Design an enzyme around this catalytic site. Structure first.
Site, PDB file in Angstrom:
ATOM      1  N   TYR A   1     -68.596  52.136 -34.111  1.00  0.00           N
ATOM      2  CA  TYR A   1     -68.569  52.416 -35.532  1.00  0.00           C
ATOM      3  C   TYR A   1     -69.261  53.723 -35.777  1.00  0.00           C
TER       4      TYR A   1
ATOM      5  CG  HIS B   1     -65.422  43.449 -38.976  1.00  0.00           C
ATOM      6  ND1 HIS B   1     -64.112  43.735 -38.662  1.00  0.00           N
ATOM      7  CD2 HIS B   1     -65.983  44.622 -39.356  1.00  0.00           C
ATOM      8  CE1 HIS B   1     -63.891  45.027 -38.837  1.00  0.00           C
ATOM      9  NE2 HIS B   1     -65.011  45.588 -39.256  1.00  0.00           N
TER      10      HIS B   1
ATOM     11  CG  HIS C   1     -62.781  46.221 -42.284  1.00  0.00           C
ATOM     12  ND1 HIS C   1     -63.198  47.297 -41.530  1.00  0.00           N
ATOM     13  CD2 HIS C   1     -61.454  46.399 -42.494  1.00  0.00           C
ATOM     14  CE1 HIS C   1     -62.165  48.084 -41.282  1.00  0.00           C
ATOM     15  NE2 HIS C   1     -61.095  47.562 -41.858  1.00  0.00           N
TER      16      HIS C   1
ATOM     17  CE1 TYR D   1     -67.332  43.178 -35.274  1.00  0.00           C
ATOM     18  CE2 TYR D   1     -64.970  42.830 -35.433  1.00  0.00           C
ATOM     19  CZ  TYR D   1     -66.049  43.682 -35.309  1.00  0.00           C
ATOM     20  OH  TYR D   1     -65.840  45.040 -35.219  1.00  0.00           O
TER      21      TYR D   1
ATOM     22  CG  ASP E   1     -74.663  48.479 -35.724  1.00  0.00           C
ATOM     23  OD1 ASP E   1     -74.342  47.999 -34.614  1.00  0.00           O
ATOM     24  OD2 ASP E   1     -73.875  48.530 -36.696  1.00  0.00           O
TER      25      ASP E   1
ATOM     26  CG  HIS F   1     -68.993  47.213 -42.077  1.00  0.00           C
ATOM     27  ND1 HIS F   1     -69.170  47.715 -40.807  1.00  0.00           N
ATOM     28  CD2 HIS F   1     -67.657  47.195 -42.294  1.00  0.00           C
ATOM     29  CE1 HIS F   1     -67.990  47.977 -40.273  1.00  0.00           C
ATOM     30  NE2 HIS F   1     -67.056  47.672 -41.156  1.00  0.00           N
TER      31      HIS F   1
HETATM   32 CU   LIG Z   1     -65.094  47.347 -40.692  1.00  0.00          CU
END
Ligand SMILES: [Cu+2]
Ligand SMILES: [Ca+2]
Ligand SMILES: [Ca+2]
Ligand SMILES: [Cu+2]
Ligand SMILES: [Sr+2]
Ligand SMILES: [Sr+2]
EC number: 1.4.3.21
Lengths: 718, 720
Positions: free
Chosen positions: B461, B519, B684, B364, B378, B521
Site C-alpha cells: 500500500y 478490506h 474497500h 481483510y 502498518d 483502511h
Molecule cells: Cu484498499
C-alpha cells in the site's frame, strides 16, 4: 501607436515586465505571450509570431501598434477557442433568437402591455436526436423552438415559438401558478414601503430616526393553508428590513419583529406584523476591507505557457478523454450535456444532461420575522440571471479561462454576463503511486478540470464546481459564503438575561446579533446514460456474515446485492457506507461485470450534515418540498421533469417536483433513468463567520464502477 | 574549470527551463526561483540580483557553469526560506550524533549482545509544561536530553533510557510477553529460509511453479487466535504469502493462492506449512510503470512563487502567517506537529501541543488460509517513519513545494537520512469568502492553505497524509490511499464462469483469475489539542427538531441539545456528522461570552465508502484486541506514555493495550488536559478501475475554531 499598459489592461490582460530579461509576459485566459522591446517576433503559447510593428519603449513605457492586440491575441496561435461550423443543438438561445422570440409573442393580440418574462429558454430537441448529433454527427432536423414563460401582472402564460419559421406554436395560461420574483419586484417593495406612513410609523417607534435609510428585502411567503392569514390568489411578498448606517452591510443591522406583507398588484402593504421592539444593532460591521489592511504576500502564479489542454469549440469542450457541452439557463445556471468518455477511440455515453436541479435554504425559527423564511434561490429568484461575474485570480485560479454567457432579462432584452463561468485545470495530488522497496518509483499526477459558476441571491453567495477527473470520475461540489441572515436580539453576551431565549434558535455571533439556525439543501439533476440509455439501479450493502468456510474466523465481509425496481424504492436515504450503482444490464466489462457508475450523494462537507429535513413531517414546507428529506432519487426520464421543487414552487400547495415525479412509482428496470442527488448542510452559526462567512464546502461524486477494464489513466498500449 | 549545467542541475535536483526567445534560464529548487542569462554577470534569485564571477557559458548549444555555481547561487542567502536556529528547540529529533551516542551508551552495558537490534531510538519527550514555556515564554528547558532506546534481543524487547547530556544509561527494562515489530533483516531472513526450504520448493512445484528462484515472498504478522491457528503464543513468528515474478515488475499480479508458510525467526526455519486447493497462478503480464504504454503529450503547468515562499523554516520551526508549529519525524508514526499556536493580533494562542498519526489498521474479510489472519498494523508492526517514501518532486507534491529531508535511526542503530521525506507547500484553495452585493463592487479574497505532506509505503500500500493549515485557523488532516492491491488467485476468468459466485463472495473480480479481496483502511490520529490552554472540557451539540411552543403557524423548530461529556467512557463514541462535538476551554470566552472551542470532525468525507466501524463480528479476536476500530471519537486524560491506538506492542498482543486500556479506568474529562483521538476509514470493495494500479482515494478530517475568535479570522489588521 498606442500605449501598451493602458491598452492591454482595458483588454483584460495581465502585463508583467521583467527588467533582467527585458521581456514582457502577457497573459489573458488561454493566451500566454512573450514579447521583447524592438524584437521582430514574439511568442504565443510557445509559437513564434512575425510582427508588423515591434514594441517600442519611449520614456520607459512600452508602445504598441494600434493593431497589436488583434495581431497577437486573435492571431490563431491561441488555440483555446475554435469555430463551431455546425452548431450543437443544445446551444442556448442567442441574443438574436431572444429578440426574435419576443417579437413573435409581442405580436399576438393576447400579449398585454406590461407583460414580463420569467424565462426565455431553448426548447430542447428530443434526446435521441441530440445524442445522434454528438455521436454520429447526424443533423437534428427539427426547428429551433423556445419556451417563453410570461408574467402578465401576476398571471403565468407559457408560450412556445418556432424560430426557424418565425411563428407562434402555442399560448397557455397556467392556472393557479405564481411567478418567481423578478428584478423590478425589488424596487416596488422598497418604493411601496417608502411611501407608507403606517410603515414609517412602525419604523419610528422602533427607534429609527431616518426612515429613508431603511432597506427592504423581499421574500416569498410560502404556503400555510391560511394560518398566515394570506390570500392564495394574490401575488404576495413579505418584507424584512435593515438599517443602512454607512458600513456597506445593512445585513448587520436588522429591524427585528417588523414584517410587511406587500401585494405587488395593488402596489401597497396589505398587512403589517409587529412584535416586541428590539433596538437595532448599530455597530459598523463592514466586510469589504474599508477598515482593514491586508498583510503583504509573495506572488503565486499558475502558468500554462503553451496554452491549455482543453479546447472550447462554440460551447463544446474537449479535454483529454472528456467531451461535453456547456450552456447557460437563467434559472438553474450551467448545464452539462452530451458528456462522453473517449475509451481508447470509442466515445461512450456517461451523462446526457447534468445541472443544478434546485435548492432551498429553510430556517428553524418560529418568530414572526422568520417562520415563513425559506429561500428557493434558483426557483424563486433565478440563479442564472443573478450569476456573479467571477473575480479573476480570486474566485478562480490565475490559470482559469473565463467565459461570457447570454440569457434574457425579465423584460426580454438579451443580457451578457461577463466572466459568468470559470474553466480551469488543476493539479490534484498524485493520480496514483507505488514505491516498491528497492525499485524506481512510479507516480503520475492527477489533473482535474473544473467548471465553476457563482450565483448570488440576496445575502448568500453559492459556488458550484463540476469536476472532471482524468480517470472517469466526476465530482460536484457546492460552496457557500457571503453574509448570514441575523436576528436582532437584546443580549450582548451569553451572560445577559435574555441570552438563553435569544439563542434558542441560533448562536450569538455578535453583540445583539444571532445567526438563526438553518439548512442549505442542494439538489442536482443528473440524467446519466451509463454507456447507454437503458440502465438499472443496483444496491451493494457491505455486510458482516458468519464464516461458513471453516478456520478460526467467526465472521466475513460480504455484500448484499439487489436491484431497486421502482421509483418509490429508489427514493431513499443514503448510507455513505453503502454502494449505489446505476448499471447497464446490457453491457459488461472484460470481467463480465455490468458497466456502472457509483453514485455518492454525500462525499463530505465542512459544515454539519443534514440527514434529512429538520422539519416535522406535518410542516407545510416539508409537505411541499419532498426532495429535502432523501439524498437519492431516481425517476424515469420525462422531458418536462427538471425541478426537485417543482416548476412553479412559489406559494405551491402541494409537491409538483420529485414528489410528483415519483408519485406514480414507475419501474426502473432496464430503462432510461434520471438520478437526483440531495445533499445539504445544517448550519449552526459561529463568530468566525461574522461579518462575512468563510466558504464552506459539500462534496458529491460519480465514479466509474467496472465501467472500464483497468486503470483508465495508464494510457494506450504501444 | 567548468561543468555541464544541465546534467549537474539534474543531479542536484533542480528544474531546468531554457527559453530560446528570451535566451533565459529559469531554475527552480524548493524556495529558490532563479533566472540567469548566458554570458550575464549577474543572476536573479527570488527577485534579487546576485553577482557571478563566472557567467553561464553557451558552447555549441550546451550550457556550462563553474563548479561552484550551485553553491554560489542556491546557497546564496537570497533564498530566505530556511534560517538557522539560534536556540535549539527541545522537541528537535535525535541528531545523527545523538543517535550514534545513545547506541554507544547501551553497547557499553554488561548485557548488550551483537545480535541486538533497535526497533525505535527516539527522543524521550521533555514535559509538556517546560516545552510550552519554551515556545511561549522562551524559558530554557533545564531538564536533560534523554533518548528512549527500544531494543530487540533475539525476540525479547528491552526498554533502555540513555541520558545524552550526561552520557549515562538511566535504565534497562526487559518487557515480558511483548513481541517486537517486524524489522528489515526479517524480510531478508524470510526470503532466505524459503529459498533454502526443500519442502517449500516441493509445495511450490505442485502448484505449477517451474522455477522456485522466481518465487517472491512477503512477510505478514500472524495476530492472535487463542491457539485456534495452532501457533504457540511466545515464539517470534511471521506468515509468508507468495507470488511469482514474471518480469512485469508487478509480482503482486501473480498470487500463489492457498500456500502459506509459517516462519520462526529465532529458529530461522519454517515451522509450519498450510496448504489448500491448487489454483493456477495468474500469468498475464500486468505492469504499472508504463513500460507497455504510450506517453501522451501533456502541456506544462507550473505553480511558481518567484519571490520565494510565504513560510519560513527555522530549524524544524515553521512560521506561516498566524501559524507557528514544530515539525519532526518519528520512525514509527512519521511526522509530528507540535507546539502549534495561532497568533491573534500579537498574542500567540495555543491550539495543539502534539499531533500525529496514532496508528492504523488494514484488516481483510476473507476467511481462507491466506487471508483470515491478515490485518496490518502498518505503523506499529512495520514502522511507517522508517518506510517513508521520498517525494517524487512535481508529482507526489506540486511543483511549488519545498521538500524536507529527515534523519532517523535504522534498526542497527546507524543514522539514516531520508531524502524528500516531507513536503511543505502553500496552495490556492478557492475564495476564502465572497459577497457580491447586487449593484455594488464585488468582495473576494483568495484562500491559502499550507500543507505538510508525508508518504509511507508498506509492502503493496502507499499511504499519503496531509496536515492542512487554513489561514482562517482551521486544521485539516486527510489520508490518501494508493498502490497495488493484495489480490486473491481464483479460477474464474469472468463472472460467467462456474466458480465466479464463490470466488467473489469476499471480493470483486477485477481481472481474469484475480479478485480484490474486500478490506478496510482504518486511520487514527492522536491529537493533543490544548484549546487556548491545557484545561479543556468536551461539549456536545446535537441539532434537533423540537415542537414549536411559541405560536405562529409552525409545528416545529430547530434547536440544540447541549451537554458536557464528563468522562472517557462516555467520550469514546460513534460520530454522527449531523452533530457538533467541541473541545471547549471553560476558562476562556470570546467577545460574546462563548467558551473558545474547536469543533472536532472525524468524518468530513471520503472517496471510498466509509467504514461505520470494524467490519468484524463482536466475537473476533482482532475486534477484541483493537477497540479503536469501532468508535470515531475518543478523548482521554493526557498521559505522557499513551500514544498508540493499537497499543505499544501490538505484535501478537492478546488484549487491548491501546485506546481500550487508556480509557478503561474511565477518568474525568472536566476542565482537564485532554487528548483527542479521531478514527476514520474506508470499506474497500474493489473494481477493475483500481487494477493494475489504484487511483489515490482520500478521506478528510477537520478541526474548526468554534467561537475561538470574535470575528471572521481573515478580515485583516484593524485600521482604528
Ligand atoms: Cu484498499
Ligand atoms: Ca438516463
Ligand atoms: Ca490537551
Ligand atoms: Cu448557512
Ligand atoms: Sr415517474
Ligand atoms: Sr485514562
Amino acid at each position: 501607436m498606442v500605449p501598451m499598459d493602458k491598452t492591454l489592461k482595458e483588454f483584460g490582460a495581465d502585463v508583467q515586465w521583467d527588467d533582467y530579461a527585458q521581456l514582457f509576459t502577457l497573459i489573458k485566459d488561454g493566451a500566454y505571450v512573450k514579447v521583447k522591446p524592438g524584437a521582430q517576433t514574439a511568442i504565443v503559447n510557445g509559437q513564434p509570431l512575425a510582427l508588423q510593428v515591434p514594441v517600442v519603449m519611449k520614456d520607459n513605457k512600452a508602445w504598441v501598434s494600434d493593431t497589436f492586440i488583434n495581431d497577437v491575441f486573435q492571431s490563431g496561435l491561441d488555440q483555446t477557442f475554435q469555430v463551431e461550423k455546425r452548431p450543437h443543438p443544445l446551444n442556448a438561445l442567442t441574443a438574436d433568437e431572444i429578440k426574435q422570440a419576443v417579437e413573435i409573442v409581442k405580436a399576438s393580440a393576447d400579449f398585454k402591455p406590461n407583460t414580463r418574462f420569467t424565462e426565455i429558454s431553448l426548447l430542447p430537441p428530443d434526446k435521441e436526436a441530440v445524442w445522434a448529433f454528438a455521436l454520429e454527427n447526424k443533423p437534428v432536423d427539427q426547428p429551433r423552438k423556445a419556451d417563453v414563460i410570461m408574467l402578465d401582472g401576476k398571471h403565468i402564460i407559457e408560450a412556445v415559438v418556432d424560430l426557424q419559421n418565425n411563428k407562434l406554436l402555442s399560448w397557455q395560461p397556467i392556472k393557479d401558478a405564481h411567478g418567481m420574483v423578478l428584478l423590478d419586484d425589488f424596487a416596488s417593495v422598497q418604493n411601496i414601503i417608502n411611501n407608507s406612513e403606517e410603515f414609517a410609523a412602525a419604523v419610528k417607534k422602533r427607534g429609527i430616526t431616518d426612515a429613508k435609510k431603511v432597506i427592504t428585502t423581499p421574500l416569498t411567503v410560502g404556503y400555510f393553508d391560511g394560518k398566515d392569514g394570506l390570500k392564495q390568489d394574490a401575488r404576495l411578498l413579505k418584507v424584512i428590513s435593515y438599517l443602512d448606517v454607512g458600513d456597506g452591510n445593512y445585513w448587520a443591522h436588522p429591524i427585528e419583529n417588523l414584517v410587511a406583507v406587500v401585494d405587488l398588484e395593488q402596489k401597497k402593504i396589505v398587512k403589517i406584523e409587529e412584535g416586541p421592539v428590539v433596538p437595532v444593532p448599530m455597530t459598523a460591521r463592514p466586510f469589504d476591507g474599508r477598515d482593514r489592511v491586508a498583510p503583504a504576500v509573495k506572488p503565486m502564479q499558475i502558468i500554462e505557457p503553451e496554452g491549455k489542454n482543453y479546447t472550447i469549440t462554440g460551447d463544446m469542450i474537449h479535454w483529454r478523454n472528456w467531451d461535453f457541452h456547456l450552456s447557460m439557463n437563467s434559472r438553474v445556471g450551467p448545464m452539462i450535456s452530451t458528456v462522453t468518455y473517449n475509451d481508447n477511440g470509442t466515445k461512450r455515453k456517461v451523462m446526457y444532461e447534468g445541472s443544478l436541479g434546485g435548492m432551498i435554504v429553510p430556517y428553524g425559527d418560529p418568530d414572526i420575522g422568520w417562520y415563513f423564511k425559506a429561500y428557493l434561490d434558483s426557483g424563486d429568484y433565478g440563479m442564472g440571471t443573478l450569476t456573479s461575474p467571477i473575480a479573476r485570480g480570486k474566485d478562480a485560479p490565475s490559470n482559469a479561462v473565463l467565459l461570457n454567457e447570454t440569457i434574457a432579462d425579465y423584460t426580454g432584452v438579451p443580457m451578457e454576463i461577463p466572466r459568468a463561468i470559470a474553466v480551469f485545470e488543476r493539479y490534484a495530488g498524485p493520480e496514483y503511486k507505488h514505491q516498491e522497496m528497492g525499485q524506481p518509483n512510479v507516480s503520475t499526477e492527477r489533473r482535474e478540470l473544473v467548471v465553476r459558476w457563482i450565483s448570488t441571491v440576496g445575502n448568500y453567495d453559492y459556488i458550484f464546481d463540476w469536476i472532471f477527473h482524468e480517470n472517469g470520475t466526476i465530482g460536484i461540489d457546492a460552496g457557500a459564503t457571503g453574509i448570514e441572515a441575523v436576528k436582532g436580539v437584546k443580549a450582548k453576551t451569553m451572560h445577559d438575561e435574555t441570552a438563553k431565549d435569544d439563542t434558542r434558535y441560533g448562536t450569538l455571533i455578535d453583540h445583539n446579533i444571532v445567526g438563526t439556525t438553518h439548512q442549505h439543501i442542494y439538489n442536482f439533476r443528473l440524467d446519466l446514460d451509463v454507456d447507454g440509455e437503458n440502465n438499472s439501479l443496483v444496491a451493494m450493502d457491505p455486510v458482516v456474515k458468519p464464516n461458513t468456510a471453516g478456520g478460526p474466523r467467526t465472521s466475513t465481509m460480504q455484500v448484499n446485492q439487489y436491484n431497486i425496481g421502482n421509483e418509490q424504492d429508489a427514493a431513499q436515504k443514503f448510507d455513505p457506507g453503502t454502494i449505489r450503482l446505476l448499471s447497464n444490464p446490457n453491457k459488461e466489462n472484460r470481467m463480465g461485470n455490468p458497466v456502472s457508475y457509483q453514485i455518492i450523494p454525500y462525499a463530505g462537507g465542512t459544515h454539519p450534515v443534514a440527514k434529512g429535513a429538520q422539519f416535522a413531517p406535518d410542516e407545510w414546507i416539508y409537505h411541499r418540498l419532498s426532495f429535502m428529506d432523501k439524498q437519492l432519487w431516481v425517476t424515469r426520464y420525462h422531458p418536462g421533469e427538471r425541478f426537485p421543487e417543482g416548476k412553479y414552487p412559489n406559494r405551491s400547495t402541494h409537491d409538483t417536483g420529485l414528489g410528483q415525479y415519483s408519485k406514480d412509482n414507475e419501474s426502473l428496470d432496464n430503462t432510461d433513468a434520471v438520478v437526483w442527488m440531495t445533499t445539504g448542510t445544517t448550519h449552526v452559526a459561529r463568530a468566525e463567520e461574522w461579518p462575512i462567512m468563510p466558504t464552506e464546502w459539500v462534496h458529491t461524486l460519480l465514479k466509474p464502477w467496472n465501467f472500464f477494464d483497468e486503470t483508465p489513466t495508464l494510457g494506450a498500449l504501444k
